[PDB]
Design a protein around this ligand. Structure first.
Ligand code: BEF
Ligand code: CA
Length: 123
């Protein structure tokens, strides 16, 4: 309807080290998001999952330890509006995006895709 949202856009992207940290400050720089998430954190990672409408969340890296806890995995068995990427590459996350913006944060076409494969969709 009319009463919608335009400032609730947030993206929580996390993983072991901070390689994802500044990797986010650049995303919000373009989107203008309010606050993103850096490094893997069970406390903040829970906010990207329990929120339900946090826009997007990335608890990548699930290898050499499978550090994804039941907060991201669960977030996958149902998949809401968001995106993800880990050593796996998304088994089949079903989001309202298109099942195309997913990966393992290999740094080369990851996060960018999630923001490039969308382009809003208003051509
Ligand atoms: F960087 Be998260 F290692 F996958
Ligand atoms: Ca990492």
């Amino acid at each position: 309807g009319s009463h919608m949202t335009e400032r609730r856009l947030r993206v929580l992207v996390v993983e072991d080290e901070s390689m994802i940290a500044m990797l986010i400050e650049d995303t919000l720089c373009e989107l203008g998001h309010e606050v993103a998430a850096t490094a893997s954190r069970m406390q903040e990672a829970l906010d990207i999952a329990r929120k339900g409408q946090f826009d997007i969340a990335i608890i990548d890296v699930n290898l050499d330890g499978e550090p994804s806890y039941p907060v991201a995995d669960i977030l996958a068995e149902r998949n809401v509006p968001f995106i993800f990427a880990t050593g796996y590459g998304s088994k089949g996350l079903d989001t309202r995006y298109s099942n195309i913006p997913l990966l393992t944060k290999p740094f080369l076409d990851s996060e960018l895709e999630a923001v490039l494969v969308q382009i809003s969709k208003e051509v």
